[PDB]
Every structure is written in structure tokens, then in C-alpha cells.
Design a binder for this molecule. Structure first.
Ligand SMILES: CC[C@H]1O[C@]2(C)[C@H](OC(C)=O)[C@@]1(C)O[C@@H](/C=C/C=C/C=C/c1oc(=O)cc(OC)c1C)[C@@H]2O
Lengths: 157, 127, 122, 156
């Protein structure tokens, strides 16, 4: 739309929200592949930051591409290689959600604030295959990665 | 041109098959080959910003995969390869590049020098 | 209708077609091998395979047999099946494009008419 | 689209130049199956012309089918029949190529302005099967069939 469209150029950082994401219950509904910042530079945030981010984005993109296809053609024909990213992706999609402190009336969850390193690390790990055992759901609406691990157990029945 | 040309061609060829990759549960090695050349050539086309290269460097690197040297290398490493490879020749081999530059093409000679330069580097690499 | 919507479907059916198309060429391959290997052995998404046995379900010299057969029939089945799947996908890629192009055109007209309409009311 | 659609109201034929064909070296890179003409009617080009043409195409059409089999299941379940359609088709495809006098300044190869009469005769025979024995490279970039013959001489 000429308006939103015309405004992008005025910004240094952009958080793009999507009803498609929100529609799934993922709050804040930011679109990981449509949100940008001018400081997303290795020279500025560092490569650990950077490599992670980019890492996170690749997989989500990788998964987007496949979504529509395994939809019809199903999952069997997919390579283990490719069905692990379906895994990790769905998990990340969740780890990205977070209970806000201003939305308890909405989520029915205590708001969590996460520090930069807790973030980087948590994702770093997911990306690393270090949680391929825990269930996705354990990754939904939680703060720090530890709550995802704790929640696995609680979910363990 | 000496390089650009075959690259342009294997890529186009990859592009034909690409979609198959991710489901390639039983490929003939014919096409499975083009799949491989594809991803490496593609990784060679990647580039960080603010670091424009000299035509000579570009061909040196392109030569590397185009000739097949990185075909056995891991896709995950090409980025690393190139970086170091190029750091190496920009350091050590300014006479080859200076050749490539001057002669404007890849002499049969410089061709052979690159062969050893890359086959020894690779070895270095996969330690 | 939404050009974006249509572009998704068309986007995705283009792939599945090529996937599907690729899977048949494979299915044919294996099936070649199979028809040959089948020859001697008798002198001793896979179609309706798993189901056919499934419904009717409710000396090893024979194990190799039902096997050596059940693969020709399977690689046969997948073949044809994937053959029609892309045949279906194609009928669709061709169909969706048309909707696209009709919408494409319509959108453009719709706008222009709006502009002209407002200009003319001054 | 209105632009194009309107335009076709007046066109009597299309000449589709194809990158795919060129890439095989084939020149002029015209598409024998996509390029069309209103006057390709026996009632207009005459039964003979019309039939040859309709012959060239079908054969070219058939080969296209087998093209899928050949690469996958290998070129051999092919019949005494299925092997001829190809052979010919492949001779045909080439015969459909040609040297231009405009491109003599360094094609080395001299240009040919094949006549209509020679055109129909040419393809007529390949279809016929007069040169089935003849080999491929005998037909690549030549004019009249006569040159298909002589090229073969020069090619054992
Ligand atoms: C899309 C390609 C198709 O369009 C064709 C008409 C054929 O389709 C069917 C309907 O017939 C096709 C499959 O193959 C092309 C054939 C190309 C042939 C190229 C031959 C080249 C060549 O042939 C030679 O014999 C010697 C050569 O060099 C020494 C060279 C360059 C044709 O134009």
C-alpha cells in the first residue's frame, strides 16, 4: 500500500508483524524474514550474533519453501537431511514467541524478558541440534531456553 | 570469459534440476553430478559487502570450482575455502595474478601453476 | 482472488509438478531393471499398493517370489501415478495462470477507473 | 493482454526464434513446432506442400515423445520402426538448419537460398527414406538435398 510502502525508507530498523503468524498464536507476531535493522552487521553486533541470526533465517526460509510442497506430496520422500530442518524450523518458530508482560490478560502467561545472550545462545543451540529430542510445544510461549527444557518435562505428562 | 562461460552453463544446467535435490532419494549420478557442481558454483557466487575484487582474483576463485577442485569439498566450507585460498594467492602468488592480469587470459602455464597451487592448498585444507 | 494468493498456489504447483515429473522418470528406471529381473524369478504414494494388500489381509523360495513381483507392481504403480500427478498439476498451472491473468488485467482497470472517476468529479 | 491480442487479429504467421534450439547449435534457430502460418492449408499450399509439411511436423512430434524414453530407459526397446522415426527425425531436424549468405563474412561456410521446390523435395525424400542410409552430419548446414549427398561423400 502506498503508505506503509512509502514509510519503510524513513526507518533504521523495522519490525514487520503478520496476521499469518499471529493467526497461529505466535506472539509477538514478527515476521523473521521481513524484519530488518540497519545494525545487523557483523562489524556492529558481531559474527556470533550475526551468524546466528542469519542461521535462523536460512532455516525458516528453507522451511517456508518446503511448506506448500510437503503439504500435498506429503513427508516420506523427504531426505532425513531435509526433515530435520522441518523439525528445527518448527521449533524455532516457537522459540521465537514470547509472553509479553503487557499481555498477560491475553496469553494467560507471566511476561518474560530475555537478555541478548540468552537469546543468541538459545537459538545457537537449537540450530546446533542440541534439542532435537524435546518436543516443539516445549518451545512455545516461553522465555529463556531453560523454560523450554523445563516445560518439556512438565509436558512429559 | 575463459571461465564465466562454463560456469554460466553448469549453473543453467543446475537450475534445470535444482528442485529435485531435496528429494533426490535415488538419482542417477549423471544428474546427481550437475546437482553437485550446482551448489558449489553457487556458493562461489556469494559475497560479503564493501569488498569488491580484482578481476584476476575473481577468475582465480571461479576457476577453482569450475575446474572441479571444490567438487569434493563440503558446501559448508566453500565460503571458508575461497576466503583463505584467495588470501593465500593475493599474498604468495602476486606474480600469477599479475600474469593472468597482463596476459589477459589463462595461459597453459598459469593454468598448471593454479593446478598445484589449489591441489596443495586443498590438501592443506582437509588436514 | 489475490495476485499474491494465486502466485502462491501457481508457485507451489509448479514445483510439485517438476517433483512429480521427476519421480516418474525414477519409477520408470527401477521398473526397467525390475521387468528384466522379473523374467527369471517367475520360473521359480505408491498407487493402490499398501491398500490392496491391506483390505484383502482382513518355504522361502516363495518369499523372493511375492517380493520379486511386489516390486515390479509397485515401481509400476508409482510410475503411472506420478505420471498423472504431474498431468494434474499441469492442468492446474495452466488453469491458474488464466485466473491470474484475468485478475491482473481486472486489477489494473479497476484502479484506473477509480482515478478517472475522482478526477472527473472536480 | 489487449496489446498482443489486438495484434494477432492481423497476423498471418509467427516466426518463433528459440534459445533452446540455438544452444544445440541449430541455426536459423526457428522453432519448427511453435512457429505457425495461416496459409498452411492444402487448399492454399497444395496437397503436396501441405502433406510434406504435415509430415515433417508429426515426425518431429513423435521423436519428441521418445526423447523422454531414450534418456531414461536407454535408446533400445526401440523398434525397427521406432528407430527409423528417430533417425529420420534427427536427419530432418538438421536438414531444417541452414547457412546464411549474411553470415559468410566469417562463417567460412557459403550461404544457401534453397528454393521452395527443392525444399519440399528435400524433406519429401527424408520422409520417404531415400537417404536413410545417409548419416547425420551429411545434413547439417547445407542447402538442397544434393549437398546432403556430397557432404556424405566428403565424410566417407
Ligand atoms: C528444444 C529442442 C528441440 O527442438 C528440435 C526441433 C527438436 O524437437 C523435435 C520436435 O524435433 C529438439 C528436441 O532438438 C533440436 C535439435 C538440435 C540439434 C542440434 C544439432 C547440432 C549439431 O549437430 C551436428 O550433427 C553437428 C554439430 O556440430 C558439428 C552440431 C552443433 C531441435 O531443433
Amino acid at each position: 500500500d502506498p503508505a506503509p510502502a512509502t514509510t519503510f525508507a524513513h526507518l533504521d530498523a523495522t519490525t514487520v508483524l503478520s496476521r499469518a503468524i499471529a493467526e497461529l498464536g505466535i506472539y509477538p507476531a514478527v515476521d523473521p524474514l521481513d524484519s530488518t535493522s540497519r545494525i545487523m552487521d557483523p562489524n556492529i553486533v558481531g559474527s556470533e550474533h550475526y551468524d546466528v541470526a542469519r542461521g535462523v533465517q536460512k532455516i525458516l526460509q528453507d522451511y517456508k519453501s518446503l511448506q506448500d510442497i510437503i503439504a500435498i506430496l506429503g513427508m516420506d520422500e523427504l531426505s532425513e537431511e531435509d526433515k530435520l530442518t522441518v523439525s528445527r524450523a518448527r521449533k524455532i518458530q516457537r522459540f521465537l514467541s514470547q509472553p509479553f508482560q503487557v499481555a498477560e490478560v491475553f496469553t494467560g502467561h507471566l511476561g518474560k524478558l530475555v537478555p541478548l545472550k540468552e537469546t543468541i545462545k538459545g537459538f545457537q543451540q537449537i540450530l546446533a541440534g542440541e534439542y532435537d529430542h524435546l518436543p516443539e510445544q516445549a518451545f512455545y510461549m516461553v522465555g529463556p531456553i531453560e523454560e523450554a527444557v523445563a516445560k518439556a518435562d512438565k509436558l512429559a505428562e | 570469459k575463459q571461465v564465466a562461460g562454463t560456469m554460466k552453463l553448469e549453473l543453467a544446467q543446475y537450475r534445470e534440476v535444482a528442485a529435485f535435490a531435496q528429494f533426490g532419494s535415488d538419482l542417477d549420478a549423471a544428474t546427481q553430478q550437475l546437482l553437485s557442481r550446482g551448489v558449489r558454483l553457487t556458493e562461489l557466487l556469494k559475497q560479503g559487502q564493501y569488498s569488491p575484487m580484482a578481476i584476476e582474483e575473481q577468475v582465480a576463485v571461479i576457476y577453482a570450482g569450475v575446474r572441479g577442485y571444490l567438487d569434493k569439498l563440503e558446501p559448508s566450507k566453500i565460503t571458508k575455502f575461497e576466503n583463505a585460498f584467495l588470501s593465500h594467492v593475493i599474498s604468495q602468488h602476486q606474480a600469477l595474478l599479475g600474469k593472468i592480469r597482463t596476459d589477459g587470459k589463462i595461459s597453459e602455464e598459469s593454468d598448471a601453476k593454479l593446478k598445484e597451487i589449489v591441489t596443495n592448498f586443498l590438501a592443506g585444507f582437509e588436514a | 482472488a489475490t495476485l499474491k494468493d494465486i502466485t502462491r498456489r501457481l508457485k507451489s504447483i509448479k514445483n510439485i509438478q517438476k517433483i512429480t515429473k521427476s519421480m516418474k522418470m525414477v519409477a520408470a528406471a527401477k521398473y526397467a531393471r525390475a521387468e528384466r529381473e522379473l523374467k527369471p524369478a517367475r520360473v521359480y504414494l505408491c498407487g493402490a499398493i499398501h491398500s490392496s494388500v491391506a483390505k484383502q489381509m482382513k518355504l522361502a523360495n516363495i518369499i523372493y517370489y511375492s517380493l520379486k513381483e511386489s516390486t515390479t507392481s509397485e515401481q509400476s504403480a508409482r510410475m503411472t501415478a506420478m505420471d498423472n500427478a504431474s498431468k494434474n498439476a499441469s492442468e492446474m498451472i495452466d488453469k491458474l495462470t488464466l485466473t491470474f491473468n484475468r485478475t491482473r488485467q481486472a486489477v489494473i482497470t479497476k484502479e484506473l477507473i477509480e482515478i478517472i472517476s475522482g478526477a472527473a468529479a472536480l
